[PDB]
Amino acid sequence: HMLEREKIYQWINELSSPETRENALLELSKKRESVPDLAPMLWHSFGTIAALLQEIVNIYPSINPPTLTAHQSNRVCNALALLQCVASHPETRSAFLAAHIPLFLYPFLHTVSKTRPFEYLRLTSLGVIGALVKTDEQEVINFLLTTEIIPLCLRIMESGSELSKTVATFILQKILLDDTGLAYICQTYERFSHVAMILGKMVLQLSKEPSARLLKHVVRCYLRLSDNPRAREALRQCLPDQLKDTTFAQVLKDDTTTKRWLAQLVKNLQE
Amino acid sequence: MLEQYSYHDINVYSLAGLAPHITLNPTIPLFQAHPQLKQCVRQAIERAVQELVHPVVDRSIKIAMTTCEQIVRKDFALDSEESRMRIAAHHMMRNLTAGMAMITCREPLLMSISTNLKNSFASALRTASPQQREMMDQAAAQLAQDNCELACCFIQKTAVEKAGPEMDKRLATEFELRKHARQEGRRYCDPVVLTYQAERMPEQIRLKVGGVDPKQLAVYEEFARNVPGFLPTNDW
Numbered sequence: 001h002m003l004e005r006e007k008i009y010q011w012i013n014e015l016s017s018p019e020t021r022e023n024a025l026l027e028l029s030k031k032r033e034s035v036p037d038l039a040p041m042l043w044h045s046f047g048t049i050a051a052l053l054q055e056i057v058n059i060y061p062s063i064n065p066p067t068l069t070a071h072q073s074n075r076v077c078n079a080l081a082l083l084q085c086v087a088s089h090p091e092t093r094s095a096f097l098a099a100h101i102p103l104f105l106y107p108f109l110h111t112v113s114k115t116r117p118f119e120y121l122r123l124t125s126l127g128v129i130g131a132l133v134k135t136d137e138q139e140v141i142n143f144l145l146t147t148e149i150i151p152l153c154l155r156i157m158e159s160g161s162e163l164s165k166t167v168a169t170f171i172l173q174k175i176l177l178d179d180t181g182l183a184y185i186c187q188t189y190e191r192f193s194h195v196a197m198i199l200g201k202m203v204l205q206l207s208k209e210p211s212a213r214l215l216k217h218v219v220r221c222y223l224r225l226s227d228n229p230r231a232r233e234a235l236r237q238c239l240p241d242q243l244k245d246t247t248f249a250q251v252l253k254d255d256t257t258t259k260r261w262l263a264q265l266v267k268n269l270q271e
Numbered sequence: 272m273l274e275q276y277s278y279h280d281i282n283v284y285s286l287a288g289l290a291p292h293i294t295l296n297p298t299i300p301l302f303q304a305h306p307q308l309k310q311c312v313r314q315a316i317e318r319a320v321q322e323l324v325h326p327v328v329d330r331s332i333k334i335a336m337t338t339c340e341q342i343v344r345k346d347f348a349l350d351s352e353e354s355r356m357r358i359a360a361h362h363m364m365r366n367l368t369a370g371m372a373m374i375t376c377r378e379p380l381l382m383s384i385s386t387n388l389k390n391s392f393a394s395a396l397r398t399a400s401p402q403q404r405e406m407m408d409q410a411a412a413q414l415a416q417d418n419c420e421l422a423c424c425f426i427q428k429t430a431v432e433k434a435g436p437e438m439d440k441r442l443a444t445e446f447e448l449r450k451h452a453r454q455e456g457r458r459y460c461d462p463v464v465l466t467y468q469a470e471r472m473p474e475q476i477r478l479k480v481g482g483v484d485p486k487q488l489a490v491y492e493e494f495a496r497n498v499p500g501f502l503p504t505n506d507w
């Protein structure tokens with residue numbers, strides 16, 4: 001098993017050179033679940049984070065016009081996968097943020113091409129942001145609110161794949177759950193309205209194409225929004241009918257948590 | 272593979288650098304019918320670049336700056352020499368600035384170049400046939416697409432040229448840490464990093480105290496060789 005650890009060190013060293021990087025990316029991304037301290041080793045070694053950023057930026061010419069191939073996508077997504085581990089680790093999270101690394105991912109979140117290489121690119125990039133907000137750190141939310149992350153998420157919640165919609169809605173949910181996040185989104189009618197309009201569209205979609213995990217997050221978002229008095233007033237007058245009738249009764253019987261959340265939502269809107 | 276311009280193919284001293292590289296597809300229906308409207312194209316592109324270059328340059332440097340400063344300070348924390356750091360920072364900053372510039376300007380350039388042409392074409396021809404306005408919109412969309420890489424490159428290079436000196440200014444204190452230490456007869460080493468590397472990092476991947484080994488610099492050399500948008504360098 002000592003041979004295992006030395007393979008890892010070697011791959012990490014082999015990330016700096018473009019000659020050996022692609023294979024090292026592949027191998028490291030496979031073992032990121034079995035190597036607990038992978039993230040600090042990547043962060044604190046020479047040139048490693050720089051190489052991962054390099055992989056990201058070198059994809060930019062293939063974004064617009066959209067020409068990204070499966071091969072290009074698979075490679076950068078291996079890099080993105082390693083950045084997700086760095087974003088998640090309590091030892092590297094703060095430094096990852098201070099270096100503003102998420103900003104170099106936003107161009108990927110902005111793509112709209114519906115080909116498989118781009119959808120995987122977007123989903124893997126969302127996964128990095130997802131890893132960030134799962135730590136429930138206030139510094140993360142404040143950083144995200146400084147950036148254009150919310151309209152990026154809203155576009156994906158509107159038009160993305162089921163998976164991408166779910167991760168993006170989860171990101172929105174985490175932001176909303178933060179007191180600062182809620183106040184930000186409810187600061188203007190325009191901001192709130194845009195969010196509410198997207199959730200409404202999603203609810204309609206969900207009535208035609210069921211998704212338990214996406215519905216859960218949508219419901220949680222509405223529930224959190226109703227903690228804000230102005231949002232509560234607006235939701236009294238514009239909550240989707242499908243959330244008030246039996247449209248989701250069947251799918252929700254197995255989902256006790258979401259069920260309680262929806263009932264709590266309805267209860268809030270009466271008061 | 273599809274990059275058609277090298278970094279030196281484009282002079283960005285003035286907007287006149289754009290002129291020789293403008294491409295006018297002769298098959299454009301608006302041009303077959305009105306060959307004279309080709310004249311309006313050059314100014315349209317120059318105007319589009321002129322209006323976008325400064326905010327794009329400012330925004331791209333601002334975004335790239337923080338990321339490059341943090342990573343370079345981190346990588347070179349046990350390097351008492353300023354020279355290796357300054358060169359690496361130079362290459363990383365110019366590269367990430369070029370990348371952010373490309374991402375920032377391409378869609379706005381399309382919108383702007385098209386608009387400018389639709390306006391020029393509508394102005395030159397006061398007539399407005401429903402068929403001709405379709406030709407005008409079509410021509411403007413085509414021309415924009417065909418000239419976006421050129422315009423983008425112009426703005427990227429403008430951004431790259433300005434990025435270097437801005438990075439120097441940002442790293443002033445890092446250069447001063449190392450200068451101050453040397454004049455005290457000691458090498459500079461970040462105390463926190465020194466401790467961490469010695470205690471926590473496996474020997475095989477540990478930062479070395481003092482200079483960094485040449486093979487490890489490979490990633491920084493690549494930033495120099497391979498800049499996004501340009502052909503790589505060759506030997507209520």
Ligand SMILES: N[C@@H](Cc1c[nH]c2ccccc12)C(=O)O
Pocket residue numbers: 150151184185190191192194195
């Ligand atoms: N700058 C935009 C960003 C934005 C769009 N839609 C939003 C919804 C919520 C919060 C922010 C946004 C705004 O605040 O309007």
